[PDB]
Write a protein that binds this ligand. Structure first.
Ligand SMILES: CC(C)(C)[C@H](NC(=O)Nc1cc(F)cc(F)c1)C(=O)N(CC(=O)NO)CC1CCCC1
Ligand SMILES: [Zn+2]
Length: 185
C-alpha cells in the first residue's frame, strides 16, 4: 500500500529527470506499480482511509513522484456533478495536439511532492488530445477540456521533469493571460 512516505519531496533529483519510455508489454512489477499508483489515489479519496494513513486528497500521480523514472501516470477525478469522471492509468502518454486557447485554475495549483503552497496562475492548454497505451498495451486516445485537461498536463509535466511552479510568472503571478479560460475547481 503506497502512502505519503513513498512520495518523494521537491528537491529530489528524480523529479527533474526525463522519465523513460515503457516498452510494451509491461512487466508484472510495472503493472503492479501502476495499479498501486491508482490505488493510492482511490485510498486518498476515501475519507476514513485518508484520515487513518494521513493522506492528502489526490486526483493524479506520476511514477517519478514515487521515485520511478518511467512514463506512467494515474488520474482519478471524481464526478464534477455533470456525470463526467476520469479514471485512467496511462502508459507513454503524449499530447499530440492542443488548443491555442489557455486555461487556468483560479487559485493556482499544488502538488503531492510540494509541501508548501506556491501562489500563482499556471496557464495550460484548455483543450488537449492525448495518445497513450493502457496497462495491457491497448491504444487510448483522449479528448480533454478544462479541469481534466489541466490535471493530465500537470501529470505529463512530471514525466519531463517540469514542476507546476516553473510556469508561474515571477513579476505578475496572479495576472491571467488574455482570453485564458478560468476553470472552476
Ligand atoms: C496537491 C493536491 C491538493 C493533493 C491535489 N489534489 C487536489 O487538488 N484534490 C482535490 C481538489 C478538489 F477540489 C476536490 C477533490 F476531490 C480533490 C493533487 O492531488 N494533485 C495531483 C498531483 O500532485 N499530481 O502530481 C495536484 C493537482 C493540482 C492541479 C492538477 C493536479
Ligand atoms: Zn504534481
Amino acid at each position: 500500500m503506497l502512502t505519503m512516505k513513498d512520495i518523494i519531496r521537491d528537491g529530489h533529483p528524480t523529479l527533474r529527470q526525463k522519465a523513460a519510455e515503457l516498452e510494451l508489454p509491461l512487466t508484472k512489477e510495472e503493472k503492479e506499480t501502476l495499479i498501486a499508483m491508482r490505488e493510492f489515489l482511490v485510498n486518498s479519496q476515501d475519507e476514513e482511509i485518508a484520515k487513518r494513513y494521513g493522506l492528502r486528497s489526490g486526483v493524479g500521480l506520476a511514477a517519478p513522484q514515487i521515485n520511478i523514472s518511467k512514463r506512467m501516470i494515474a488520474v482519478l477525478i471524481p464526478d464534477d456533478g455533470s456525470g463526467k469522471s476520469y479514471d485512467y492509468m496511462l502508459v507513454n502518454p503524449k499530447i499530440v495536439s492542443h488548443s491555442v486557447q489557455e486555461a487556468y485554475l483560479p487559485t493556482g495549483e499544488g502538488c503531492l511532492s510540494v509541501d508548501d503552497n506556491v501562489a500563482g496562475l499556471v496557464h495550460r492548454h484548455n483543450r488537449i488530445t492525448i495518445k497513450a497505451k493502457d496497462i495491457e498495451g491497448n491504444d487510448i486516445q483522449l479528448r480533454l477540456k478544462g479541469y481534466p485537461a489541466i490535471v493530465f498536463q500537470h501529470e505529463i509535466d512530471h514525466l519531463n521533469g517540469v514542476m507546476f511552479y516553473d510556469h508561474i510568472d515571477k513579476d505578475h503571478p496572479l495576472q491571467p493571460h488574455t482570453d485564458a479560460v478560468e476553470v472552476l475547481e
